[PDB]
Design a binder for these strands. Structure first.
Ligand SMILES: [Zn+2]
Ligand SMILES: [Zn+2]
Length: 105
DNA sequence: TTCCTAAATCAGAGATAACC
DNA sequence: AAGGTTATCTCTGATTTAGG
């Protein structure tokens, strides 16, 4: 078990939010008292596995992504290319390909 | 000093489940 | 096998404790 807000793996008392997640005591109390997520000393780590053996994006050729998706032909595509196609019904152009992947909140 | 926020601890409501 | 009692667990909310 780990806290959804801060990633802590131990706490004096586990609490939960209204949607199936666990919160450490500190984070749970903060949210209830203020209505906002408990601010972190340092950002909560995440990122995870960005590569997969034997896989690259059929549309932009990248080998790293936050989530491997599939195109209509059944080939793996990276998260950016799969989402761009869903929104625009055209493939994401190579001109949009960037050097790295950003992280958020 | 007193005020206030943060977060551990305490009380007990409701969930789980041992055992008859 | 199923159902009732109620020990015990696991939370939510109240209170206490500690610092700034
Ligand atoms: Zn937390
Ligand atoms: Zn791609």
């Amino acid at each position: 078990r780990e806290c959804v807000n801060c990633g802590a793996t131990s706490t004096p008392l586990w609490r939960r939010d209204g949607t199936g997640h666990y919160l450490c005591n500190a984070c749970g109390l903060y949210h209830k008292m203020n209505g906002q997520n408990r601010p972190l000393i340092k950002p909560k780590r995440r990122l995870s596995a960005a590569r997969r053996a034997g896989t690259s994006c059929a549309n932009c050729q990248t080998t790293t992504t936050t989530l491997w998706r599939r195109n209509a032909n059944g080939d793996p595509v990276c998260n950016a290319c799969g989402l761009y196609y869903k929104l625009h019904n055209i493939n994401r152009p190579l001109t949009m390909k960037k050097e790295g992947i950003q992280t958020r909140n």
